[PDB]
Design a binder for this molecule. Sequence first.
Ligand SMILES: Cn1cc(NC(=O)c2cccc3ncccc23)cn1
Lengths: 156, 39
Amino acid sequence: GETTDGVYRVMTRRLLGSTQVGVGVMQEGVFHTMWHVTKGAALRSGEGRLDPYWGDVKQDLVSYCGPWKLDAAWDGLSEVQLLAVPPGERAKNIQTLPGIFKTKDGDIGAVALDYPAGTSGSPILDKCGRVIGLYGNGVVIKNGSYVSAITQGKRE
Amino acid sequence: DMYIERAGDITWEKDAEVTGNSPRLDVALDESGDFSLVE
Ligand SMILES: Cn1cc(NC(=O)c2cccc3ncccc23)cn1
């Protein structure tokens, strides 16, 4: 099917109508999403099939057709954009400066932009349009709003 | 069999909406890939 670079919607018909369970990034002939969106399942594009290649439930990441390709990193200073893709709505850039997840293993960029879980897998970009990570794994805060890590994988 | 549909080019927009804050949260992560707050 479609192997063009860009952002995609991840849909199912295993519920009422067609439901968007998440989002992903096609780059260098590899599809990149969050593990919680597909649970490692195969995907259809056209009449073509995408088979899982790499996945990790703890990173909550999964690649199709090839190894993880996205290696760019939040610089720690500059604003970023959630190129969000909500369910039933057009792609929309939402610009912000990332806050911080502090953990025993290290510090991770975060974004506090709440959206349907169906936006899970939407790519976060830097000033050069490089994907520095995916939106949709983080935490509900006192407020009640959601804050997402900038989840990035490792390129081999 | 879950299916995908394309949605756009991977582009920074000049003159895009600038919202969202920058919090400093103390976070943990469980073996099942769920983040949690550590007060
Ligand atoms: C099993 N699992 C599910 C997730 N992520 C979410 O559900 C989620 C993603 C994005 C935005 C959200 N806003 C409010 C509430 C949840 C979310 C991570 N792991």
